[PDB]
Amino acid sequence: YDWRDDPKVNKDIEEDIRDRGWHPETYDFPYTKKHDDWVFDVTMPSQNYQTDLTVNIHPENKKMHVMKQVMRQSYWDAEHDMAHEYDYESEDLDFQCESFKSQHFRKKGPISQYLILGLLPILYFGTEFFYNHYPDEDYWRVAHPPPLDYPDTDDTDDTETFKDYKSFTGRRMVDTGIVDPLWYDIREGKKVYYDWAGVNQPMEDI
Amino acid sequence: QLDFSHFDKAFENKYDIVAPEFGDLHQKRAEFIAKNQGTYRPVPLVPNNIKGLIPKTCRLPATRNWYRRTSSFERNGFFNIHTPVLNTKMIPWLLF
Amino acid sequence: YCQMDPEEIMRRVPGITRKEAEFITKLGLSPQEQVDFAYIAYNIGLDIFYFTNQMFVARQVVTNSKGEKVEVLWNAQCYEDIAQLNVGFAPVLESVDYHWEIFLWA
Amino acid sequence: STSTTLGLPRWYKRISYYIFKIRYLQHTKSKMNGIPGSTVRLMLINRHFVEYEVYEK
Amino acid sequence: LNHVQNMLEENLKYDAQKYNDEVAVIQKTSRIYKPTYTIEFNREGEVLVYSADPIKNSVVYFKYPYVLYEAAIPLFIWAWIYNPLELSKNAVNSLLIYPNIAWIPRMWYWRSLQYKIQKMYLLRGGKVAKIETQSLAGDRFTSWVETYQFHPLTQDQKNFDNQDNAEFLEDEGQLKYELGVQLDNLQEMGTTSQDIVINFMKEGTVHHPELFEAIVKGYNIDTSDYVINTANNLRAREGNHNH
Amino acid sequence: MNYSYKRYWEPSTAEVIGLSLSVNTISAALTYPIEFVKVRSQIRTEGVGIRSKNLYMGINPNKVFREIHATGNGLRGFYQGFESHLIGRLSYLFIRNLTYKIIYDRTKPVKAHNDLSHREKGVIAGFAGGLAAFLTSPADLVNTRTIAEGGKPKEWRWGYKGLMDGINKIAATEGGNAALFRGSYANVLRAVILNISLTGPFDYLNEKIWITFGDMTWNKYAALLWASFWGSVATLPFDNIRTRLYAQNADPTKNRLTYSGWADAAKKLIQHEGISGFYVGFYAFYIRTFLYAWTTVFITDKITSDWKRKAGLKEWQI
Amino acid sequence: MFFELEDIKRRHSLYWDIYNVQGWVRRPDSTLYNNVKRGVTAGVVASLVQENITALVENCKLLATKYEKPQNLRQAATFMKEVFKLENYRKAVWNRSQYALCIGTFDIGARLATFRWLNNGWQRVFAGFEFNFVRKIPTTMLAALFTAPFSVPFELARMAYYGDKTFPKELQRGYSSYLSALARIPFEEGPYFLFKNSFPLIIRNFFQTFTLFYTYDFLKDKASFAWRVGEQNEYACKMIIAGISTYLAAVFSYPWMVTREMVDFWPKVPGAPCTFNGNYRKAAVWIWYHEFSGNYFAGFFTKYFWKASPGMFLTLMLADKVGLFDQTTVDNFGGAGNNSWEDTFV
Amino acid sequence: CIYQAYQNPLRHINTGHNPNNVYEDIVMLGDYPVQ
Numbered sequence A: 001y002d003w004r005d006d007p008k009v010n011k012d013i014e015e016d017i018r019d020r021g022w023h024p025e026t027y028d029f030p031y032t033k034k035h036d037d038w039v040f041d042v043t044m045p046s047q048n049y050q051t052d053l054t055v056n057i058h059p060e061n062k063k064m065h066v067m068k069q070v071m072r073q074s075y076w077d078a079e080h081d082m083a084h085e086y087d088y089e090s091e092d093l094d095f096q097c098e099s100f101k102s103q104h105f106r107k108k109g110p111i112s113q114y115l116i117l118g119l120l121p122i123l124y125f126g127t128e129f130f131y132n133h134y135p136d137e138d139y140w141r142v143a144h145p146p147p148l149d150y151p152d153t154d155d156t157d158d159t160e161t162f163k164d165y166k167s168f169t170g171r172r173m174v175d176t177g178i179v180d181p182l183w184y185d186i187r188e189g190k191k192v193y194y195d196w197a198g199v200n201q202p203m204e205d206i
Numbered sequence B: 001q002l003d004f005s006h007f008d009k010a011f012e013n014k015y016d017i018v019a020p021e022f023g024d025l026h027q028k029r030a031e032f033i034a035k036n037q038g039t040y041r042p043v044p045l046v047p048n049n050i051k052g053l054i055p056k057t058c059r060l061p062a063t064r065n066w067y068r069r070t071s072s073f074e075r076n077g078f079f080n081i082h083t084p085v086l087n088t089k090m091i092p093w094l095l096f
Numbered sequence C: 001y002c003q004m005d006p007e008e009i010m011r012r013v014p015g016i017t018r019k020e021a022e023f024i025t026k027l028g029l030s031p032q033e034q035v036d037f038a039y040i041a042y043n044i045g046l047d048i049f050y051f052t053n054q055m056f057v058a059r060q061v062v063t064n065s066k067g068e069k070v071e072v073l074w075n076a077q078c079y080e081d082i083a084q085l086n087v088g089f090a091p092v093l094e095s096v097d098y099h100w101e102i103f104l105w106a
Numbered sequence D: 001s002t003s004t005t006l007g008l009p010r011w012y013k014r015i016s017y018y019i020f021k022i023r024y025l026q027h028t029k030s031k032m033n034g035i036p037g038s039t040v041r042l043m044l045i046n047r048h049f050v051e052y053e054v055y056e057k
Numbered sequence E: 001l002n003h004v005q006n007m008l009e010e011n012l013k014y015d016a017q018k019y020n021d022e023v024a025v026i027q028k029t030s031r032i033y034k035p036t037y038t039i040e041f042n043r044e045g046e047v048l049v050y051s052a053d054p055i056k057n058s059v060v061y062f063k064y065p066y067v068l069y070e071a072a073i074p075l076f077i078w079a080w081i082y083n084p085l086e087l088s089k090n091a092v093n094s095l096l097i098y099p100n101i102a103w104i105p106r107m108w109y110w111r112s113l114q115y116k117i118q119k120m121y122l123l124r125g126g127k128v129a130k131i132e133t134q135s136l137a138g139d140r141f142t143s144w145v146e147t148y149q150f151h152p153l154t155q156d157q158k159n160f161d162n163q164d165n166a167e168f169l170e171d172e173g174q175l176k177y178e179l180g181v182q183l184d185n186l187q188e189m190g191t192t193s194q195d196i197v198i199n200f201m202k203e204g205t206v207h208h209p210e211l212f213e214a215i216v217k218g219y220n221i222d223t224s225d226y227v228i229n230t231a232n233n234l235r236a237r238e239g240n241h242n243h
Numbered sequence F: 001m002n003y004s005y006k007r008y009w010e011p012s013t014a015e016v017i018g019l020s021l022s023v024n025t026i027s028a029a030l031t032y033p034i035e036f037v038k039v040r041s042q043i044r045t046e047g048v049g050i051r052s053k054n055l056y057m058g059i060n061p062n063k064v065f066r067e068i069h070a071t072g073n074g075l076r077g078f079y080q081g082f083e084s085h086l087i088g089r090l091s092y093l094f095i096r097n098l099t100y101k102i103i104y105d106r107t108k109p110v111k112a113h114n115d116l117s118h119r120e121k122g123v124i125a126g127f128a129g130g131l132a133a134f135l136t137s138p139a140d141l142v143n144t145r146t147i148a149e150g151g152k153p154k155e156w157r158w159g160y161k162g163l164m165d166g167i168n169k170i171a172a173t174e175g176g177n178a179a180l181f182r183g184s185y186a187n188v189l190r191a192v193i194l195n196i197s198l199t200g201p202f203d204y205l206n207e208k209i210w211i212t213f214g215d216m217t218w219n220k221y222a223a224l225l226w227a228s229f230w231g232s233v234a235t236l237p238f239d240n241i242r243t244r245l246y247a248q249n250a251d252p253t254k255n256r257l258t259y260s261g262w263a264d265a266a267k268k269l270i271q272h273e274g275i276s277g278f279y280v281g282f283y284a285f286y287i288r289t290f291l292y293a294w295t296t297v298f299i300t301d302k303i304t305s306d307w308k309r310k311a312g313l314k315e316w317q318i
Numbered sequence G: 001m002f003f004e005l006e007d008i009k010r011r012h013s014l015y016w017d018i019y020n021v022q023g024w025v026r027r028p029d030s031t032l033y034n035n036v037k038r039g040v041t042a043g044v045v046a047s048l049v050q051e052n053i054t055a056l057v058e059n060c061k062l063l064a065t066k067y068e069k070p071q072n073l074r075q076a077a078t079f080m081k082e083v084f085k086l087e088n089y090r091k092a093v094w095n096r097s098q099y100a101l102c103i104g105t106f107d108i109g110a111r112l113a114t115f116r117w118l119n120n121g122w123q124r125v126f127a128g129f130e131f132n133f134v135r136k137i138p139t140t141m142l143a144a145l146f147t148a149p150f151s152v153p154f155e156l157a158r159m160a161y162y163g164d165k166t167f168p169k170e171l172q173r174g175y176s177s178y179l180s181a182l183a184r185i186p187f188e189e190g191p192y193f194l195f196k197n198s199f200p201l202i203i204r205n206f207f208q209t210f211t212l213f214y215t216y217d218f219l220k221d222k223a224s225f226a227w228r229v230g231e232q233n234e235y236a237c238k239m240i241i242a243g244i245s246t247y248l249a250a251v252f253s254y255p256w257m258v259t260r261e262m263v264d265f266w267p268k269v270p271g272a273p274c275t276f277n278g279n280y281r282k283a284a285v286w287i288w289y290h291e292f293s294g295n296y297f298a299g300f301f302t303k304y305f306w307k308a309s310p311g312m313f314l315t316l317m318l319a320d321k322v323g324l325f326d327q328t329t330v331d332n333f334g335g336a337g338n339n340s341w342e343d344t345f346v
Numbered sequence H: 001c002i003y004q005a006y007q008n009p010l011r012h013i014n015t016g017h018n019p020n021n022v023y024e025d026i027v028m029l030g031d032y033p034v035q
């Protein structure tokens, strides 16, 4: 006996209210305990008052009793289960004994791995996309427009587009309205997108 | 002691109390509550004579209700959400 | 809770006992169902003072043609699914026992 | 886990119906054994509010 | 939250605890009525006390103001069709709400028609009353109620009538007016409901006026002087004119 | 990555000392109660270990806090020994920062975009932390004893009423200055482990999340969470052993479980409680370290960015 | 260099993608001052309206408990006229208006500001519906957790004042008003008096804010097809969405607040330990694992719905009006939408 | 089979079936039962 394992003596053990009245360590395997039976005097009186004219039953006045927590599932005993399942190789005959206690009963174990089970979709998708950088390393990064005339004019065409917008034809097209207004301004060596463009400024070249 | 068969005060975990947790006034209020939990019954102030209003000297019948409840209570404390009132109330919504 | 008169129940089913009638009245059934259950229980010999569980749902004592009284137990059943059937050995509704081998001895 | 059938998958007979009803009522009573009655719950709900300004009518 | 102190909350908790500890499921009542005459119970151990055909005796189709409610549907439909007010699409579509809500009060009235007691029996012991009613669709509902849960209402139906001195029976024994009684707890179709008002129509024969009045006023009837009549006149699902 | 650093501006020694002292002062003032609760939980669990099962395995920091507050001392009761804790923390920070900056200046690479490897930085930080902890051990001992007084029986309490008072009492009653260095080895080990188990994981996860999601603001704080968790995982056993050694009273009869050294304490802990016993108060330790690191990093980054902007560095160089 | 952990700063090279939109770009209007101002405005207005409604309802109930409830329109009109002139009603209006100001400024404003801060940058799809809404779930959860405990101190102060008002003169603090009580409690009982056993309020606030803000933001974009293709009334659709959001918030929040009644108000079985040991967290776990919902959903409307839902509905409407739920939408084939214009017409 | 001997090397011809540190073959290397 060790008081450290006794909840009554050891106050550091946090009792679980949802498991009150249920002790997995006391189960039979196979379970052969009766914990439910006829219950009266809660709402239905145990005595007889069918023909009592001076007594009327009021079920509304139900006195509160102790909460009946739902039965807790059995918890595994690691050493006992390992010994029970253990079989000696070239010493034991291959047979099943008459006693039913030899049945391999399933008992619940640690719940830690079930956290990873529950988070598996998040973990699996993260491994698929973020860990492997699928489809490419740039899809999940915050998007930044290319710097001014970067990487080359043939691809960027910022200066030519600016000149076209500032030209007579660009102004006339903007007036027609088929083409939207210019979205960036070429500052002193840098391109700055207007706040209404709804995009981030280009990343610095370092 | 080293042996764990019987408990020893060396492992006792109880912090000493030096004063009320929330003040002497709070302690006095708690003591008064314990002494007169039911004997002291303050009530909100309401006028006792109103011309238009009719004093409520009796329990009113169900025919005075402007609204009909849907849920109900079993006499054993169970709360019924499915009731004949709900059955009749769900017909228009389901039809639509 | 509208318990029916045990005397009336006994009158309707002459052979039933006062204790059985009172227990039936205590049971939460409408008076008509209480009377019908009393009739069925008396006629079959079923013991109403039996708490149904997952092993047997009821028990009865019946005198066979040889004059001997024998006990007949109504087993808890399942709908074409042994997996759903609760294999237990306690008077408990909860499915506490889990078996890796459905047929231990084959 | 607890089976919803309580050991009576089919009500092929009124006796089976009665047995299922009896055990279902007993189980419901046991499950509801730990909560207050209708009167207590209703009074608590009705008089939950305790925030007033002027007292001593 | 519990550390905050409130005298109203403390009084509420004390009242709840005191109620739970004091009032028990079993209660003592001295309201016992002993009928002068011997009671002749049916073969089923019950005595009939009230009979009526509320569906037969009530107006079902042409009832006010439900006729008024339903007469406006063509007006709304015509308004939506022809848009006489030159409204926008959503505004005109808003006129189609009324046809989908106009018939609800008639449904509620038809439902209420099924709460008028069709048949009433008193069981052995004078503590249980069985009330049988039907809906306009022919469904038959029977419910058992303990006698103490009855509370008669005034003729105006706006207040609780004094249980002791209630004047709702004529000298011969019939009802002066359509009586209303509130059942504190009614178990209908295996569901318990609170404060359900039911009615006994004036155009309905009242058998055993003493027993009917005792049940209405909530007295427990003493059935010591009883006889049993073996008459199997009523069959299961028997037809009647309450259709 | 070896050229991904941007050390374009380095604060002077005086600036480093002043900023570190002020920021550590405010951080310790903010996060002291968590450390108090952690120490009290370790003391109360000493000699028994974790006896709950599954989700309840451990000691509830909220429960410990509520029990401490129920004593009637209010929130001021959670700052008992705060003067000693602050003095010890300030001395440790001063010594460690001075030594680390001196060595870093001596052995820094010439290029501004190159920095010492994580291994070399960890070696320097561990040496500096060990030296500082060895020098400032008595303050930590006094603070831990003051914290554990409340948990321990009144007859076993020491009744220290300040850092200087505790130092004098230890020197006189126990005799000799050697009594002031009890648990110094454990403190040095804890300091070394904490120094080496923080900078690595932070940069690891910060760079990885930058590669994944690019440049964002939540990256620093996610990396901070990761680094704090792993630092707690690495250091908590040493903190527990140091707390046990400090709480060990001079008299064996007063001691509930006497220890002769770091190894002896570890052996006793393993014997009387599983290896899980080293991680009592893990939630409290994690919260304490995360809050301290977050506040320190936030204030230091704000001040450093302001100073860099005043100097005139480019946006990317900051 | 400063302490044990080093915040290493690193430089990185340029990187860009084809599309510059539909990701995270912080809106220009998302600033500490502007978001705080808008959130404070919306929260203050919503709290004022909610507290006025609660005071009116409670005074109506108080008057009805002593006088028969209205029987017709004229009786209802005179009942309201007499309620409006009650001294208790006026004092409640004043104190709860102060409480509304405080809470709308320090809890609802904080919630709105944090939500805007963490969700302003999530752009939407042009000529389409914002997919990948899961990206917003962490942001809303972060905001809900951060801003959950911002109302518990004010609520505890209000409860302490209303419970002080009901003690004898000797044991009464004598708080002049709610603001006076709020200023005095921290120094008299201590700061922890306003935070002890705050789990019910904290979880209630978390569920409210999360399932309200996130659900409204989700719906206002996903159900937008009603007015974008079906030509339905946008304002009516938004009102319906806000109603659904507030109803869901009330449903998800009330069960956690029910822990107050079970732990403290439910009668205790003599000679037996408390079922939940006086722990609101354990009571909440029991509610979560309970089989029957109605048992802890009893009293949903008479207790919490009409005290919470109208405020949340008004908060959502005002936030939408000011622009706390407005996202930026730009064409992905426009000039700034993508960096590859050669395939936008070909 | 580590620091705990459960099986019987007397009845087991070879003790190398499972990892262990507490079993030894009865017929060791170099042992040859010969008539």
Ligand SMILES: CCCCCCCCCCCCCCCCCC(=O)OC[C@H](COP(=O)([O-])OCC(O)COP(=O)([O-])OC[C@@H](COC(=O)CCCCCCCCCCCCCCCCC)OC(=O)CCCCCCCCCCCCCCCCC)OC(=O)CCCCCCCCCCCCCCCCC
Binding pocket: A076, A081, A106, A107, A108, A109, A110, A113, A114, A116, A117, A120, A123
């Ligand atoms: C660091 C991780 C980082 C994050 C990523 C993690 C990714 C994980 C995989 C994700 C998907 C599955 C997640 C399921 C987790 C929950 C399992 C569960 O139900 O609880 C245990 C549960 C036991 O508890 P219980 O049923 O509640 O009650 C019994 C009591 O435990 C009492 O039981 P007892 O009396 O029998 O005592 C023993 C009990 C006591 O110990 C414990 O319970 C400890 C906690 C559980 C540990 C589980 C794994 C242990 C290591 C397995 C290694 C292989 C076997 C070699 C020997 C290992 C010895 C330790 O231990 C067990 O029962 C463990 C048995 C596990 C058997 C594993 C081999 C099964 C075949 C593989 C099928 C699945 C294939 C998936 C991949 C497909 C790829 C195409 O066992 C099962 O139900 C069996 C599940 C077996 C399959 C799933 C788990 C194995 C996953 C292997 C890795 C797959 C990787 C694939 C992706 C990456 C590839 C590189």
Ligand SMILES: CCCCCCCCCCCCCCCCCC(=O)OC[C@H](COP(=O)([O-])OCC(O)COP(=O)([O-])OC[C@@H](COC(=O)CCCCCCCCCCCCCCCCC)OC(=O)CCCCCCCCCCCCCCCCC)OC(=O)CCCCCCCCCCCCCCCCC
Binding pocket: B064, B065, B066, B067, B068, G053, G057, G069, G070, G072, G073, G076, G240, G243, G244, G301, G302, G305, G306, G310, G314, G317
């Ligand atoms: C950005 C937009 C913003 C817009 C503006 C917003 C401004 C703020 C608005 C704030 C509103 C606050 C409302 C608070 C009410 C508090 C009630 C309360 O505590 O009840 C406790 C009550 C329990 O109380 P108890 O003490 O246990 O009752 C026991 C008595 O035995 C049993 O009770 P009793 O029979 O003795 O009852 C006495 C009766 C009090 O006695 C009377 O009823 C006498 C007065 C008779 C006249 C009735 C009103 C006449 C017309 C004026 C309407 C003004 C309404 C203004 C409020 C509107 C918003 C709610 O009290 C009541 O039952 C409540 C009366 C309230 C009026 C209800 C009817 C409103 C119809 C509205 C029609 C449209 C008007 C349009 C106006 C134009 C502008 C919008 O439990 C509940 O909470 C149940 C309420 C259930 C209500 C809904 C019923 C139908 C549900 C079906 C679904 C329909 C909705 C579908 C979804 C729609 C949304 C997606």
Ligand SMILES: CCCCCCCCCCCCCCCCCC(=O)OC[C@H](COP(=O)([O-])OCC(O)COP(=O)([O-])OC[C@@H](COC(=O)CCCCCCCCCCCCCCCCC)OC(=O)CCCCCCCCCCCCCCCCC)OC(=O)CCCCCCCCCCCCCCCCC
Binding pocket: F130, F131, F134, F181, F182, F183, F184, F185, F186, F188, F260, F261, F262, F263, F264, F266, F267
């Ligand atoms: C089986 C294990 C398997 C591996 C896993 C490990 C698990 C471990 C835990 C669980 C198992 C139980 C433990 C078993 C440990 C076994 C090893 C062992 O023996 O270690 C014990 C060893 C010592 O334990 P101990 O017996 O408790 O001794 C500590 C006493 O408690 C200290 O007493 P104190 O606290 O009262 O100290 C007072 C202070 C009293 O102060 C004095 O020393 C006084 C005399 C000197 C005063 C002057 C100091 C200098 C200042 C003046 C300078 C000159 C003047 C300058 C100008 C004027 C101004 C100042 O004394 C000291 O300084 C310390 C004692 C030595 C003093 C004598 C002279 C030493 C000179 C050399 C050092 C100099 C620098 C020291 C400071 C550090 C640098 C800053 O502990 C350790 O090594 C710690 C654990 C192991 C760490 C290494 C990690 C290995 C594992 C690697 C991973 C493996 C993974 C793979 C698995 C492998 C499986 C095999």
Ligand SMILES: CCCCCCCCCCCCCCCCCC(=O)OC[C@H](COP(=O)([O-])OCC(O)COP(=O)([O-])OC[C@@H](COC(=O)CCCCCCCCCCCCCCCCC)OC(=O)CCCCCCCCCCCCCCCCC)OC(=O)CCCCCCCCCCCCCCCCC
Binding pocket: F060, F061, F062, F063, F065, F066, F287, G141, G142, G143, G145, G146, G147, G148, G149, G152, G191, G192, G195, G196, G197, G198, G199, G200, G202, G203, G206, G279, G280, G281, G282
């Ligand atoms: C931003 C992060 C976003 C992350 C998003 C993540 C999304 C995915 C996951 C979502 C789910 C996460 C769930 C988390 C675990 C929850 C576990 C649980 O339910 O049990 C915990 C705990 C259970 O404790 P217990 O032992 O069962 O006690 C039961 C009693 O009913 C209740 O226990 P009690 O009454 O003993 O304890 C009440 C607690 C109440 O504490 C509070 O009200 C403070 C807020 C945190 C409380 C969290 C509980 C305590 C945790 C340990 C210590 C936390 C330190 C502070 C927070 C940082 C570290 C986490 O009181 C204290 O611990 C002491 C308060 C100190 C006195 C007042 C002075 C405050 C400081 C004032 C000066 C500094 C600030 C102003 C000046 C600034 C400079 C100008 O329950 C709670 O306290 C509430 C849990 C509610 C769960 C629903 C989700 C909401 C969670 C809110 C927590 C965070 C609030 C915001 C602060 C942090 C960010 C800035």
Ligand SMILES: CCCCCCCCCCCCCCCCCC(=O)OC[C@H](COP(=O)([O-])OCC[N+](C)(C)C)OC(=O)CCCCCCCCCCCCCCCCC
Binding pocket: F001, F117, F118, F119, F120, F121, F122, F123, F126, F127, F130, F192, F196, F200
């Ligand atoms: C049976 C047991 C025998 C025990 C004794 C004999 C064996 C002893 C073995 C010791 C091993 C020590 C390992 C340290 C950790 C290394 C981790 C590692 O390499 O991770 C990869 C990383 C590699 O970092 P990196 O610099 O290459 O860059 C990382 C970034 N990338 C990947 C992009 C390049 O190393 C670290 O993060 C190391 C951080 C810690 C460094 C400091 C270690 C401790 C130094 C102590 C110095 C002395 C203190 C004072 C002592 C006073 C008393 C004497």
Ligand SMILES: CCCCCCCCCCCCCCCCCC(=O)OC[C@H](COP(=O)([O-])OCC[N+](C)(C)C)OC(=O)CCCCCCCCCCCCCCCCC
Binding pocket: F050, F055, F056, F057, F058, F059, F060, F061, F230, F233, F234, F275, F276, F279, F280, F281, F282, F283, F284
């Ligand atoms: C695998 C090869 C290595 C060699 C062989 C293996 C030998 C070592 C085996 C160690 C087993 C694990 C021991 C710790 C178990 C803790 C269990 C637990 O959670 O207890 C409850 C405690 C209780 O903490 P609490 O007191 O805060 O309680 C809070 C919990 N409630 C609210 C429920 C009370 O929980 C924790 O501490 C959770 C985190 C546990 C983290 C364990 C880390 C162990 C690391 C050991 C080695 C050092 C790190 C090295 C690697 C990283 C750095 C490089």
Ligand SMILES: CCCCCCCCCCCCCCCCCC(=O)OC[C@H](COP(=O)(O)OCCN)OC(=O)CCCCCCCCCCCCCCCCC
Binding pocket: A121, A122, A123, A124, A125, A126, A127, A129, A130, A131, A139, A140, A141, A142, F213, G019, G021, G022, G023, G024, G132, G134, G135, G136, G138
């Ligand atoms: C059913 C499950 C899957 C559900 C669908 C998920 C689809 C996307 C893949 C995500 C997988 C993990 C779950 C994360 C959900 C919330 C964050 C998210 O979805 O990230 C998207 C968003 C950036 O995406 P966005 O830029 O908007 O994309 C369009 C750009 N033109 O990013 C953000 O908003 C920033 C979020 C930062 C934090 C993310 C943390 C993710 C961690 C995942 C697990 C990692 C495990 C690694 C294991 C390593 C083992 C060695």
Ligand SMILES: CCCCCCCCCCCCCCCCCC(=O)OC[C@H](COP(=O)(O)OCCN)OC(=O)CCCCCCCCCCCCCCCCC
Binding pocket: G225, G226, G229, G230, G231, G232, G233, G236, G237, G240
């Ligand atoms: C979006 C498709 C994918 C999602 C799942 C779809 C499931 C379909 C199941 C069938 C029943 C739902 C009705 C069909 C889907 C919704 C309507 C739709 O697809 O939008 C188009 C529809 C008609 O528009 P159309 O005439 O084609 O536009 C041409 C413009 N020149 O536009 C309309 O007329 C608008 C009608 C909106 C009705 C929405 C009902 C379902 C949403 C939940 C209930 C909302 C209740 C409140 C509605 C308030 C409206 C004011």
